[PDB]
Amino acid sequence: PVVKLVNLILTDAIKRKASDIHIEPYERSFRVRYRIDGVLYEVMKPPLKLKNAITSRIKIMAELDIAERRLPQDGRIKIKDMDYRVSVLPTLFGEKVVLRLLDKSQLDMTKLGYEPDALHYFKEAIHKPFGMVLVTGPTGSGKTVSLYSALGELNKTTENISTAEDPVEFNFAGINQVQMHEDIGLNFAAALRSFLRQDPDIIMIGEIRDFETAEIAIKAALTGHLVLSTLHTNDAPATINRLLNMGVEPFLVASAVNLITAQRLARRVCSECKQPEEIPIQALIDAGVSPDEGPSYVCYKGTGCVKCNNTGYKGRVGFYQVMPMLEEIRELILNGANTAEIKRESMRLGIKTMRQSGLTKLKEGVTSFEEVLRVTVAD
Amino acid sequence: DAPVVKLVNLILTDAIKRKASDIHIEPYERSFRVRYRIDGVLYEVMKPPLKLKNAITSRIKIMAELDIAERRLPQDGRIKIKMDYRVSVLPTLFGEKVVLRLLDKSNLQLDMTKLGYEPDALHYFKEAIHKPFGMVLVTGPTGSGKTVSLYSALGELNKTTENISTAEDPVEFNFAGINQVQMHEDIGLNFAAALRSFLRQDPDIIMIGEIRDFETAEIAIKAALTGHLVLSTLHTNDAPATINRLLNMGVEPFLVASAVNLITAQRLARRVCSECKQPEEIPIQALIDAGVSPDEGPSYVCYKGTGCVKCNNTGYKGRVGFYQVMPMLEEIRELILNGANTAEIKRESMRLGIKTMRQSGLTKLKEGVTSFEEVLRVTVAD
Amino acid sequence: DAPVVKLVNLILTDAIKRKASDIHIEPYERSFRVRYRIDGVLYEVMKPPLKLKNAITSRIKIMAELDIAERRLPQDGRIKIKQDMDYRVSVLPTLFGEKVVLRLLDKSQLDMTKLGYEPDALHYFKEAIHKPFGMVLVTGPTGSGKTVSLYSALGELNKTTENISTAEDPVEFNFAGINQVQMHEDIGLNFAAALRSFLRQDPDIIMIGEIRDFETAEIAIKAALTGHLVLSTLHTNDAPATINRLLNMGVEPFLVASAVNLITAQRLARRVCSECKQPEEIPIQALIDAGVSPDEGPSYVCYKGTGCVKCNNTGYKGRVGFYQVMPMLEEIRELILNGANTAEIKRESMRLGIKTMRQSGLTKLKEGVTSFEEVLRVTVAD
Ligand SMILES: Nc1ncnc2c1ncn2[C@@H]1O[C@H](COP(=O)(O)OP(=O)(O)NP(=O)(O)O)[C@@H](O)[C@H]1O
Ligand SMILES: Nc1ncnc2c1ncn2[C@@H]1O[C@H](COP(=O)(O)OP(=O)(O)NP(=O)(O)O)[C@@H](O)[C@H]1O
Ligand SMILES: Nc1ncnc2c1ncn2[C@@H]1O[C@H](COP(=O)(O)OP(=O)(O)O)[C@@H](O)[C@H]1O
Ligand SMILES: [Mg+2]
Ligand SMILES: [Zn+2]
Numbered sequence A: 001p002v003v004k005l006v007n008l009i010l011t012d013a014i015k016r017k018a019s020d021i022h023i024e025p026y027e028r029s030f031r032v033r034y035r036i037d038g039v040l041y042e043v044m045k046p047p048l049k050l051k052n053a054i055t056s057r058i059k060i061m062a063e064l065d066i067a068e069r070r071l072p073q074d075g076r077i078k079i080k081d082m083d084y085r086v087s088v089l090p091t092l093f094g095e096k097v098v099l100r101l102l103d104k105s106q107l108d109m110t111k112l113g114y115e116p117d118a119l120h121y122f123k124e125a126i127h128k129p130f131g132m133v134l135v136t137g138p139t140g141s142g143k144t145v146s147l148y149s150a151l152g153e154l155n156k157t158t159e160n161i162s163t164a165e166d167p168v169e170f171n172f173a174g175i176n177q178v179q180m181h182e183d184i185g186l187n188f189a190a191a192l193r194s195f196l197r198q199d200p201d202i203i204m205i206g207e208i209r210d211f212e213t214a215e216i217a218i219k220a221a222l223t224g225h226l227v228l229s230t231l232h233t234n235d236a237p238a239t240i241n242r243l244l245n246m247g248v249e250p251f252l253v254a255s256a257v258n259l260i261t262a263q264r265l266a267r268r269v270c271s272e273c274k275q276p277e278e279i280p281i282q283a284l285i286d287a288g289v290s291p292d293e294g295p296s297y298v299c300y301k302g303t304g305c306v307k308c309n310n311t312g313y314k315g316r317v318g319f320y321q322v323m324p325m326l327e328e329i330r331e332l333i334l335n336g337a338n339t340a341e342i343k344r345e346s347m348r349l350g351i352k353t354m355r356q357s358g359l360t361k362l363k364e365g366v367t368s369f370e371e372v373l374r375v376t377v378a379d
Numbered sequence B: 001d002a003p004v005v006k007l008v009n010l011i012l013t014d015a016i017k018r019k020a021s022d023i024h025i026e027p028y029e030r031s032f033r034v035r036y037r038i039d040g041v042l043y044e045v046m047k048p049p050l051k052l053k054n055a056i057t058s059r060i061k062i063m064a065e066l067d068i069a070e071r072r073l074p075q076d077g078r079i080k081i082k083m084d085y086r087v088s089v090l091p092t093l094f095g096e097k098v099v100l101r102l103l104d105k106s107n108l109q110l111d112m113t114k115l116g117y118e119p120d121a122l123h124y125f126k127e128a129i130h131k132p133f134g135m136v137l138v139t140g141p142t143g144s145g146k147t148v149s150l151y152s153a154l155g156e157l158n159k160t161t162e163n164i165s166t167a168e169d170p171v172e173f174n175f176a177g178i179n180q181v182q183m184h185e186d187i188g189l190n191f192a193a194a195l196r197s198f199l200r201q202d203p204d205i206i207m208i209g210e211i212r213d214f215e216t217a218e219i220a221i222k223a224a225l226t227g228h229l230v231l232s233t234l235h236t237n238d239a240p241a242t243i244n245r246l247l248n249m250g251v252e253p254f255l256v257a258s259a260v261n262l263i264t265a266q267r268l269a270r271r272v273c274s275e276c277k278q279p280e281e282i283p284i285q286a287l288i289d290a291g292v293s294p295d296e297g298p299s300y301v302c303y304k305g306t307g308c309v310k311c312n313n314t315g316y317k318g319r320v321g322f323y324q325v326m327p328m329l330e331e332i333r334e335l336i337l338n339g340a341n342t343a344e345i346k347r348e349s350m351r352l353g354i355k356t357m358r359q360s361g362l363t364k365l366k367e368g369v370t371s372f373e374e375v376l377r378v379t380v381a382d
Numbered sequence C: 001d002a003p004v005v006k007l008v009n010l011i012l013t014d015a016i017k018r019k020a021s022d023i024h025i026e027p028y029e030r031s032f033r034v035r036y037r038i039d040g041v042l043y044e045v046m047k048p049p050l051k052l053k054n055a056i057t058s059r060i061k062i063m064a065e066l067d068i069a070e071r072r073l074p075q076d077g078r079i080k081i082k083q084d085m086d087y088r089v090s091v092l093p094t095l096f097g098e099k100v101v102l103r104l105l106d107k108s109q110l111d112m113t114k115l116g117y118e119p120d121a122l123h124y125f126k127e128a129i130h131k132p133f134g135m136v137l138v139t140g141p142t143g144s145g146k147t148v149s150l151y152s153a154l155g156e157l158n159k160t161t162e163n164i165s166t167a168e169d170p171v172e173f174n175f176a177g178i179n180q181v182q183m184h185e186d187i188g189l190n191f192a193a194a195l196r197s198f199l200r201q202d203p204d205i206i207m208i209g210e211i212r213d214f215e216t217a218e219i220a221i222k223a224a225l226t227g228h229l230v231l232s233t234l235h236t237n238d239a240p241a242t243i244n245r246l247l248n249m250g251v252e253p254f255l256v257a258s259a260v261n262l263i264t265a266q267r268l269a270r271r272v273c274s275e276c277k278q279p280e281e282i283p284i285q286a287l288i289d290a291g292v293s294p295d296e297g298p299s300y301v302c303y304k305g306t307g308c309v310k311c312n313n314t315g316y317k318g319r320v321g322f323y324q325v326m327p328m329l330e331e332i333r334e335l336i337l338n339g340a341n342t343a344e345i346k347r348e349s350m351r352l353g354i355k356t357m358r359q360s361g362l363t364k365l366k367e368g369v370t371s372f373e374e375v376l377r378v379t380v381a382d
């Protein structure tokens, strides 16, 4: 009965073109709201007796902790396919649940916004016969799209590609995709060991979270396989310190990793209402613009039009830090250099930081100065 | 049983008739007293028998559904009497001290036009909260009416088309349609954790109780840049100094100029009792020193209450707000981006007609609603 | 009636007569002695026969309700003697017997004028604690007078119009009107939990016994900026070093610059006995090396006590405080935000006239309150 009601809330939202579902308890009421074309509408008022059953069911569908009701929790629901991003939030009179429709509908690497130098290092690293490629960033930074874009360039009938994902974001023909199931025993570590017995060529791990997974992944890269994975780290230099703090010996990181990227997703200025805004040149220089390049900058910002919902932005751009494991960086790891020394050395060799990549796209007029300062830290 | 039940109920009802905000039930080694906070000042209203020390505090526990067996640890609950009270139990060395916070929605005034804003200031505040995105900061110390200003703004925005989420420490009043979160930092639910959760909750309007550090300030500023309306508070000396506070926290100057729509500063002064109101012979030179023009000085008629039954013999009844409403004008924005300090931002705001809190206090002094000592206590000279 | 019973009573009462703070009963291989700590310095007061060491120790443990059967482990307890004197008893198992330490706990000044503050330092301290918000930090090593200074500040602020709440470990003196909470960590009542409960108790003034970790420091400094007056202590060695200690713990710089009203550093130095005192011929050059200006050098008259029965033949009777009272002046705030080190902060405070502890000691030397040897013993050179 309650399962039927929850399924109706989900199936009614896809029929009514809703992008978000809001299940909200209050002291004297309990309502469900759909966001349709940016506007919330009350679409249902279930009785107050059912609010515990409806919330628990959704938390079970999202594999969340039903015993904990005081802390925020975030999960995911897949229905057939429609995928929901679940967010639980402890209010005064119960838990509020928000489900956000994920619109899956460009896997092409040449259209992701990599600068030519960055795209060169990235393509060079994934076409090596073995080694590790790490794509880092926070949630919603485009990591998975970058990984799948790399798998597209590599997917040939001549190579065996196997992935361990939690969950499988997209179904790829020719790619052997395994979905994780921890309660049964199918985690990243178990899949990696089986992959080594599967005559593999390219291995993709959804994320390196623990030393047990890093150990097998590093070993697989040194054995002669190409290993791609992700981590949640601040930048590419800090990714090295993360692996070391997990217990991986420094010489194994120096020799196994081909390449580490760090990326953030910024908004692209609306091409219809963009126009220059007056920014003192000293502000640009304080943000990392060299004094010589300063005067040549034209910082664009959308004023807000109908083609962008009066936001001034339409679309997104990528700010990439593509750091190859250059020999200078390898020696620094072997000498136990800290994150600061590794970042400075990478900048000396021409590896642009995410801040510098953002200033480049600001120079090209495709993003605003506030976006650069919002998603990147200073160097 | 009944003598204590009657006494405890009398403690709760006399607080309502005196219009007190809080009740303090405090045991000591050789005494026992009850204090009401009336218009921000505590007063001794009762010295009950010390034999009833444990009986009185235990009765309120039962009303608050708290643990009578535990008397060594702090406890917190709520009471509804057929008027709501928030209860806080503190274990001192001579018994449990109980504090009760009166929460009457009926007494709360939420219409923005009845909060005491001057019409030009009210226009800029309303314009700021009805913009689709940006940040609005209401500054002042705790107990300066900031939450009422925020609740008034949220009530003006509480439509079924928007999702409003608040993070409060604690939640003073609850409103239908508004998703409110009470902070519980002992278990990890601080302002930052609730802010990052709000960003995954598909928000439209976000209210934060106070911005206390760089981490929360960064999430708040950047949420105001990504299409959300952000309402929050800080404790600063005035509206112009709120700019320097954010910069010192670590926020980039360009993001402050881009994200903030408006900053207000406010203080709560006590309102002179209308019945015992009498003219006070404040020397003209004292008024000129406070900021009154010398040509206006002799015309000023300062008032103060002599004390009567209607005002609990305090001379005051109610509160008035001294407001400074500073919109993020383009002139002020250009000052921020050129590294201007607090003094030159304050001069620029006064140049453009933005009244300071001292000027707002002196206006209320001229109208006879507040006293000369209240103006000097809560405001500084310009 | 028994010999040892009378002897133990003599040791306990003689300490009260001599104004001792601590009693040390120490057995060694070939000797046995009793030492009193008088004005912070230990003196041998008795040499009882070593044969009696087990009877004296056993007798004290009976009065302290300690276990006489156990002689290999440390034990702790209390003793109350009848007008009452309390003793905190600590037993320690040395190689040649059990050592016993007794700590006298006597309430028997409250007045700030009798503690040793110079008029300028007193003015800065009084205006800082009378502000409606901010943090006041009293720093110094153990036994430097921090609790007395805070109790003295609370006494000047103890009004019926304000709510004062303290978290102490332990509570050392009971004040009517002040809500004092004693820490009990084993049940979860620590400084952090008590401070969080105070914030739900409608506070005005909060006193935290000591800041011993970053978690408590952040809560306390943020509560002060929210709009409360907060008093606490740290174990640092001067006022400028307290600034960097807070920063090194992880407190954000804007919090230190904007939320701290004032920081004090202090040491206790012994006073020359008024009965004993005689002038001491200190070479004028030696005074100059200690930090006295050349103009003032020849005018100094330094005194030293020869020793009399009234001062226990030490030349010193009582103690006085050397205070460095540093208000958070605007010049100092700019240094916190610009990353200055302790030496820069110290040089700048001296430039603005903030007297160091050494200079305060030299002031007491000129006035004949303390001796030249005491200034060099308890203060470092600048
Ligand atoms: N280069 C890009 N430019 C613009 N948008 C992008 C880009 N790459 C990905 N996106 C968008 O990012 C969204 C999904 O981001 P995603 O790659 O899932 O983040 P993520 O890093 O995988 N988060 P998580 O899986 O929780 O670690 C998609 O809807 C894409 O439209
Ligand atoms: N200004 C003063 N002049 C003379 N004597 C003082 C002064 N201040 C305190 N004392 C005495 O010296 C002793 C100092 O103890 P107290 O003030 O508790 O030190 P404290 O800093 O609290 N030590 P601790 O709590 O262990 O860090 C007390 O017994 C006071 O009676
Ligand atoms: N403009 C006003 N006029 C009269 N009373 C007010 C006004 N603003 C606030 N108050 C009262 O003062 C009390 C304290 O205000 P509140 O906003 O809760 O404190 P803070 O400013 O610390 O958030 C409230 O309970 C409210 O009833
Ligand atoms: Mg102490
Ligand atoms: Zn547009």
Ligand SMILES: [Zn+2]
Pocket (backbone or CB within 6 Å): B273, B274, B275, B276, B277, B305, B306, B307, B308, B309, B310, B311, B312, B313, B315, B316
């Ligand atoms: Zn009256």
Ligand SMILES: [Zn+2]
Pocket (backbone or CB within 6 Å): C273, C274, C275, C276, C277, C305, C307, C308, C309, C310, C311, C312, C313, C314, C315, C316, C317
């Ligand atoms: Zn003497």
